[PDB]
Design a protein around this ligand. Structure first.
Ligand code: MG
Ligand code: ZN
Ligand code: ZN
Lengths: 36, 137, 100, 33, 183, 49
RNA sequence: ACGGAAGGGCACCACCAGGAGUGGAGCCUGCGGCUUAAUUUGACCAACACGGGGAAACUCACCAGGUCCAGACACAAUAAGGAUUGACAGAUUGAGAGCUCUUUCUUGAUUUUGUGGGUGGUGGUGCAUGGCCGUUCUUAGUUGGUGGAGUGAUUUGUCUGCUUAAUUGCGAUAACGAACGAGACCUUAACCUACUAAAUAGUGGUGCUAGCAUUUGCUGGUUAUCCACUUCUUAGAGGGACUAUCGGUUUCAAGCCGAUGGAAGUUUGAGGCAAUAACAGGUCUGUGAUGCCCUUAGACGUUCUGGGCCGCACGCGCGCUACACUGACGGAGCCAGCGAGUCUAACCUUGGCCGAGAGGUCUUGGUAAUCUUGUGAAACUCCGUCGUGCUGGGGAUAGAGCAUUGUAAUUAUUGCUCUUCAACGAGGAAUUCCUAGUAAGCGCAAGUCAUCAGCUUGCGUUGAUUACGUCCCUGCCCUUUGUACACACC
């Protein structure tokens, strides 16, 4: 039932193949990228 | 010269040659075929016509294919038929004829291979002709 | 001239023999030396099964049989005769294999 | 792209142009005019 | 191996037969050689259909790109006749009479199923000479079993032909029991 | 997502009906006992005795 | 067509005369009953080791939980600022499952929700069906042409009587000549000092022959050690049996009975195929065979976790062990046949190594007449002890430990060693199968198998008694007969 809130109009990690648009969510000690 | 003989599935091949009264069965002498009751069944195709009656012939037979008594019957048929062939080709046709007469007067499928073959077993029951059992009611 | 072994396997006896027997004449017409055609025993692929798709009726089993027959010949022929004898034998239904 | 891969391997089956048979469990497909 | 190899060849033959019968039904398929009641749509638009079928069979079987009187044929034709619409009894009668005048020495068509709702009956049409059964039925008889899928129910159609032993052109040329002398 | 089924009836099925029962895993058939009986003569299995 | 009508005939799905059993015990197993969350369902001579169903994941269709869409194709919705999907940080369910949530991030015109519509079902309906099988049928029947009898529907032919497995045939005869089915056909198991060809089989003459004996002779290894052969084996064309000959019985004959010959004289033994038709026989729980309905995103679709089908006051059937001296236990002798087996890889395993055993280890041979495999099997023979006993037959019953199969042996898979030797001391009324390589005893291979047989399908070793028939019973067929039945006794 994941709703995926609309996310209305708005750093970086390893694996530099990402196109500099993978700004993370800074909850705590977030060294874990959203990709993997 | 060479003959073969069978009773149910065991085939025995016997070579008879001009030699000195040596009759083997599987490498052992005829005194030690060892069914321990058919030691005279194997003696029969030699004791029938004469006591020894042969010191000039050598018969070596090799038998495989069946069971103990089946192989005994196979060898006792094969050596008798080898003797018949040896007399037919070398010794005399008359002599072959009078020994065939004795073989047929004591016929024990000695000269003719027994045609009794195991009949195929059919579905629905152990054994060819006996069927499984039903009680139903 | 090289030595070869020709193997024929099939289920159709008519074509199997029609091939294994013209091979002998194909060799003799060129006057070759060969060991005769050897018939390795026919093996039956008999398999029993239950006739009905369910469990009613008297227990009746029916067997299906697939008889596979197969021969082998030794020959001595040059590469040209080898390719000729492997090219004429394209009879559909008999598997032919040539080893050197 | 996850669909473009198959769309380009060929050279949805109900829009048209694609005849599908089963024919012993292998999902045969043919493209037609 | 050899037994496994030829078993694989046999199941591959069955695969070819089933696939070709399902796909090439519209062209009047009879059996894999391929054999169709007309040998013109086999080529089609100068080879398009056969090239497509070769491509499909290669893709399936991992193959290299470069390496009238038939019982099944008449059965599928009469299936098409029933499916696209014609009286069932009339269709069976037409099929049997056609096979009869096409030189075949005997025909039998059995149609079973829900013609009209009932307890499903079996209606038959048998003409000429037929022997069933023995070895000579494998020798000279062609049999086909077909499932007709109409909008209501399924009809089982069995078509059996006793082909003329005289015009055999292979194997025995007469009946096993045929005894004829000259004087 | 999917637990291993590298053995057993979850691994093997009839290539025709996909039935896990009646499978003939002999001679390289991998085909059901009922599909076998139906389409048997097309494989080469004849009835002789 | 049916009859709670009669008469013939046939059948070890009947008997006579017998053999071996089952029913009496334990246990494997299926069915009924009982409760459980379910102990899944179908089937009641022709159900009950049957559903090739020997159920730990899957099988499974059941119960309790957990996901997911793999809801085709249209329609409209910020969805061209975004529709959806996934996601680590954490509680959360076994689940490292973003099931959900605290929470903000990737890509972005595939999706989600509506709106139909669907797709699948081991969901029901086999009183809607197809196919297929079983039964009627380990029987035998059915049909037209010409003619005859009938106004006719129809009938005769298709039969009194004999003979056959047989509507097989003789014979009698208003029938004659025929057709399908039965026979015929084919498969196989017998033979063939005849043909064809064989280090993918076998046998003999030579050197590689170590033993014994030494005038040379017996077993003898030498798998690329030469030659030839096909008698033994293999498989292709073919031959043989057709009841042949002779006696007798035979209505007149079909046939049958004895002896001889024969390879085999009961269709040569055994099967495959098997008609005109009917069953409210079984299967929708094999089929991507299928009419109708149900379900459809809290699913009856798929999938995962655990159980379950095995369960125990009880009843029934098919079976193995069985109850002992024709025996048990040890050595000892060593004889099969059907077959199965991995080139996309872990199958049959040989020979060494370890282990008492199970089992593991180095390999090796085999894609196969080559290697397992000569299946060095059991039963059995021989030699010893046991002494006639619930014992030393039985290993039922549980515990302890030892390993492999299995991601999983708990609800003993199985094997192994030890420990108790329990019921069974020959089985009531009853009751099953069976007539010579068959009964029975014995084991082998194959299907299910990642592992397990007591099941089945084939195979072979040892190989009897009784009779060579009858209608006493049982079953069915035919004929006659009654019918107010014709949807045909539901
Ligand atoms: Mg009549
Ligand atoms: Zn990244
Ligand atoms: Zn199948």
């Amino acid at each position: 039932k994941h709703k995926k809130v609309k996310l209305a109009v708005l750093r970086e990690c390893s694996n530099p193949t990402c196109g500099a648009g993978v700004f993370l969510a800074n909850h705590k000690d977030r060294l874990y990228c959203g990709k993997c | 010269v060479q003959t073969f003989g069978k009773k149910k599935s065991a085939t025995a091949v016997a070579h008879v040659k001009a030699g000195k009264g040596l009759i083997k069965v599987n490498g052992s002498p005829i005194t030690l075929v060892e069914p321990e009751i058919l030691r005279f069944k194997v003696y029969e195709p030699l004791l029938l016509v004469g006591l020894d009656k042969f010191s000039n012939i050598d018969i070596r037979v090799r038998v495989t294919g069946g069971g103990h008594v089946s192989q005994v019957y196979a060898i006792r048929q094969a050596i008798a038929k080898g003797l018949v062939a040896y007399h037919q080709k070398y010794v005399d046709e008359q002599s072959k004829n009078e020994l065939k007469k004795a073989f047929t007067s004591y016929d024990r499928t000695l000269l003719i291979a027994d045609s009794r073959r195991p009949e195929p077993k059919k579905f629905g029951g152990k054994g060819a002709r006996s069927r499984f059992q039903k009680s139903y009611r | 001239i090289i030595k070869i072994r020709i193997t024929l396997t099939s289920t159709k006896v008519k074509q199997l023999e029609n091939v294994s027997s013209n091979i002998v004449k194909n060799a003799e017409q060129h006057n070759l030396v060969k060991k005769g055609p050897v018939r390795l025993p026919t093996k039956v692929l008999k398999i029993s099964t239950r006739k009905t798709p369910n469990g009613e009726g008297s227990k009746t089993w029916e067997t299906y049989e697939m008889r596979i027959h197969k021969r082998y010949i030794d020959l001595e022929a040059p590469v040209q005769i080898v390719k000729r004898i492997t090219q004429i034998t394209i009879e559909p239904g008999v598997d032919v294999e040539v080893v050197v | 792209e996850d669909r473009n891969k198959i769309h380009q391997y060929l050279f949805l089956t109900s829009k048209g142009y694609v005849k599908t048979q089963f024919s012993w469990q292998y999902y045969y497909y043919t493209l037609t005019e | 191996s050899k037994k496994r190899k030829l078993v694989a060849d046999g199941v591959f033959y069955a695969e070819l037969n089933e696939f070709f019968t399902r796909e090439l039904a519209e062209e009047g398929y009879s059996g894999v050689e391929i054999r169709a009641t007309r040998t013109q749509d086999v080529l089609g638009e100068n080879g398009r259909r056969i090239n497509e079928l070769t491509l499909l069979v290669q893709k399936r079987f991992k193959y290299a790109p470069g390496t009238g009187l038939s019982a099944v044929a008449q059965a599928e034709s009469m299936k098409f006749k029933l499916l696209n619409g014609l009286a069932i009894r009339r269709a069976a009668y037409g099929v049997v009479r056609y096979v009869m005048e096409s030189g075949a020495k005997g025909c039998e068509v059995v149609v079973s199923g829900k013609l009209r709702a009932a307890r499903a009956k079996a209606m038959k049409f048998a003409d000429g000479f037929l022997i069933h059964s023995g070895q000579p039925v494998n020798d000279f008889i062609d049999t086909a079993t077909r499932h007709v899928l109409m909008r209501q129910g399924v009809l089982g159609i069995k078509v059996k032909i006793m082909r003329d032993p005289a015009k055999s052109r292979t194997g025995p040329k007469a009946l096993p029991d045929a005894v004829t002398i000259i004087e | 997502f999917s637990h291993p089924r590298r053995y057993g009836k979850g691994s093997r099925q009839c290539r025709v009906c996909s039935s896990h029962t009646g499978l003939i895993r002999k001679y390289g058939l991998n085909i059901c006992r009922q599909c076998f009986r139906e389409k048997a003569n097309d494989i080469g299995f004849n009835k002789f005795r």
